[PDB]
């Protein structure tokens, strides 16, 4: 009877950066995955494990909506078993993913003429992220053998770099907002239905 708050997840005025992707848990509400599929505005809507038309009746304990902003050419990396600077260092999806990935273009509201640098992606990390890991640490990356001692210098780089978002970039470089829904079951009762 209580529509799940998918609006504010997909209607948010300020999306989080990919390195600080925002996870909103959804529980104790009735979610209709019918305005979400037939919206006719989503560039990408790819469901892993559960069919898009059949999950409208599958009942789940929790539904995690993970939202962030990436580039267009990097949407393919939000998928199981993908290697890339976002799959490896910013946001990793499990190989046995049982959710959906939604993505839509955002040159509007997110591509200021002067350049929107509020969004950062991680260039470097010591090791690849385990599935669903959030690393918001800004420690200097030591590429060389000389310890950095916390100062930015040669072979000592800041992991986070700003996306270059301009109103003239090619579709590959234009900003895409991405929401990854993780539908999970546990021994707890299924509080998510439709």
């Amino acid at each position, epitope marked *: 009877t209580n529509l799940c708050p998918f609006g504010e997840v997909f209607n948010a005025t300020r999306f989080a950066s990919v390195y600080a992707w925002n996870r909103k848990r959804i529980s104790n509400c009735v979610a209709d995955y019918s305005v979400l599929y037939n919206s006719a505005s989503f560039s990408t809507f790819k469901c892993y494990g559960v069919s898009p038309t059949k999950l409208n009746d599958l009942c789940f304990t929790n539904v995690y909506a993970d939202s962030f902003v990436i580039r267009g050419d990097e949407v393919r990396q939000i998928a199981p078993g993908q290697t890339g*600077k976002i799959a490896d260092y910013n946001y990793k999806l499990p190989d046995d993913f049982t959710g959906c990935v939604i993505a839509w273009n955002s040159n509007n509201l997110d591509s200021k003429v002067g350049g929107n640098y509020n969004y950062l992606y991680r*260039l470097f990390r010591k090791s690849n992220l385990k599935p669903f890991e959030r690393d918001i640490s800004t420690e200097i990356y030591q*590429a*060389g053998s000389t310890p950095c001692n916390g100062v*930015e*210098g*040669f*072979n*000592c*780089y800041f992991p986070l*770099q700003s996306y270059g978002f301009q109103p003239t970039n090619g579709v590959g470089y234009q900003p895409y907002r991405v929401v990854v829904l993780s539908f999970e079951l546990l021994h707890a009762p299924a509080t998510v239905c439709g």
Partner: antibody
Amino acid sequence: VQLVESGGGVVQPGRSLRLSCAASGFTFSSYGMNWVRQAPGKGLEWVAIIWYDGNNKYYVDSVKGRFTISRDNSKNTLYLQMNSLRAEDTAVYYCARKDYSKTYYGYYFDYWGQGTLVTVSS
Amino acid sequence: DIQMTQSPSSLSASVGDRVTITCRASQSIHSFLNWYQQKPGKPPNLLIYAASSLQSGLPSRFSGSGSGTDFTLTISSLQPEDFATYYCQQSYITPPTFGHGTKVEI
């Protein structure tokens, strides 16, 4: 944008030399600068880098401890003080500009000079 | 530092042929490979930076492609002015190491 080198020549082994590079056509105190040497019939070999702040200088092995890269931003000149020269430093030395990137990990040499030959064998 | 191997060391090609020069890194350098062109007895000229970006003003025939360890410079139409030595350089870790170079013959 021009980068003209000078100071090369024949120098006896174990002696010293100072290569200069005069730059024109752009603001000097905004670009990192580089020295890259090419031995005859061999590929390019990066020699040294000086950052635009005048404090961060990096050298390649076999050059560290001998060569000193510096810049006089007030004169629009880049120096390379080559001390204790060996026989293996015969090469043409180019002063290469570093892009306007501000980042330590993605730079390229957009504008090169013309090259000055520094023969060392006695 | 990172060792760079450029293959082939020398290539024979005719006008209008396809040329492909591969630069391989001992360690991952991400997308921080640059390609320079040097004709004999002349200063090197920048062709590619970031492994995919063509320096402004240069002919569009040149292209780059690669990520991590393997990189490729492709010349679609080898014109008479494209016969020179091509070097690959990594900017991921200072020192920036140049490849030993690939010369293009007739």
